[PDB]
Symmetry: C2
Subunit: 232 residues, 2 copies
């Protein structure tokens, strides 16, 4: 097996997750239909939101296939002060948010969004594991430019890349993972005003089974294209 | 190069750090002499403490040689409610504690010492990186038994073992390391009543240069033997 410098197999076939035209392959989190607000505009997936403000289910969008070991790639562009997020180990649990069961690869305009600086030491910047690990380096482009994201999960090792540069790496199922969860908003020990202590046991078990890839609801100003995956 | 299952080279020669009789090879942190309180008793190094309560320097004991990549082994026995700690990347900085510049491999009677439960989720238990990473599993023996510790540092990867079982692993110089430091007492962001925010930049740079191995002052009830190292 040929391996790249991060020890990740270089073989496999890419499968396209987005046809450039429709949301075929995609559906809402915990539902069979596409939630109101998601559209295809100029060859990109984007959440615009709806004038219909009725209390429907969760609105996050997932690709309709579970993955475990993979190399996932997606390109994204953010409008000024935009925000979104990519989930990649999510479990469908009725009544429970998508972000309780997956790390979030954060998407943010670092220059213009106040949540950028509301983390601890950059852990809510673009490319972070939201509220857990800050990226270093920070290769995000200015708003209005297309960024390339790659996320690798391989035998519980997780690597985030941004614009072809590795920005963080960690491993599920380890005491380090537990320590990171323990200090986050997902902790049973958290005193954050955005605390979600009921996520704790789910977050501890991330990556121990297959999960979904998807994107955040209310992710204003973010467009996605060139979405593909190689199973490992 | 033959590697063990953790990818650590299996070749090299062991060098004995303790002769079983004297403290030859050892000296105080930031000093040429052995601090009052350290003795050899029944073939083990131990800190008894002194009736002399005069304000001398720091009292921690280091082996008089810097190391970078190595496999370090030491055996220890703790009396009921004892405590100590092993440093392994320490810098000698006059006026600054030893524990500002090295992770501490914690030694504790988990059953009988209140600092055991004063951490977050076991990060002050035996084998922890003190205040940063809890061990999992926890293979420590009951007090009064000899435990075997192994600490590996190899190209910035750190592995703790206890009684021949791996208990945690991490890597210096990474955003994960920074996140772990950020949530500890060593953080510039800390609100611990034992906060040491002036350690922050030193702790972030651990493992970027050679450092000392040593043991904590006021480490009551802990005896050390069979102390050896293999440079990698």
């Amino acid at each position: 097996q040929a391996l790249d410098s991060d020890g990740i197999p270089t073989g496999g076939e890419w499968i396209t997750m987005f046809d450039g035209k429709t949301l075929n392959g995609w559906r809402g989190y915990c539902r069979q239909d596409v939630p109101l607000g998601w559209v295809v505009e100029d060859g990109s997936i984007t959440y615009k939101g709806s004038d219909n403000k009725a209390d429907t289910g969760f609105g996050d969008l997932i690709y309709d296939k579970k993955f475990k070991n993979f190399v996932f790639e997606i390109e994204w562009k953010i409008d000024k002060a935009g925000n979104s997020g990519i989930f990649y180990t999510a479990q469908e649990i009725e009544g429970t948010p998508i972000y309780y069961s997956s790390p979030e690869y954060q998407l943010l305009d670092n220059e213009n969004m106040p949540d950028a600086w509301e983390g601890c030491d950059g852990n809510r910047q673009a490319g972070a594991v939201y509220d857990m690990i800050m990226p270093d380096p920070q290769p995000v482009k200015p708003y209005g430019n297309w960024n390339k994201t790659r996320i690798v999960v391989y035998n519980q090792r997780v690597i985030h890349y941004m614009n072809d540069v590795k920005i963080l790496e960690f491993q599920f199922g380890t005491p380090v993972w537990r320590a990171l969860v323990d200090h986050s908003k997902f902790s049973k020990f958290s005193t954050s005003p955005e605390k979600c202590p009921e996520a704790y046991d789910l977050m501890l078990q991330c990556g121990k089974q297959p999960g979904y890839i998807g994107m955040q609801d209310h992710g204003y100003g973010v467009c996605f294209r060139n979405i593909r995956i190689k199973e490992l």
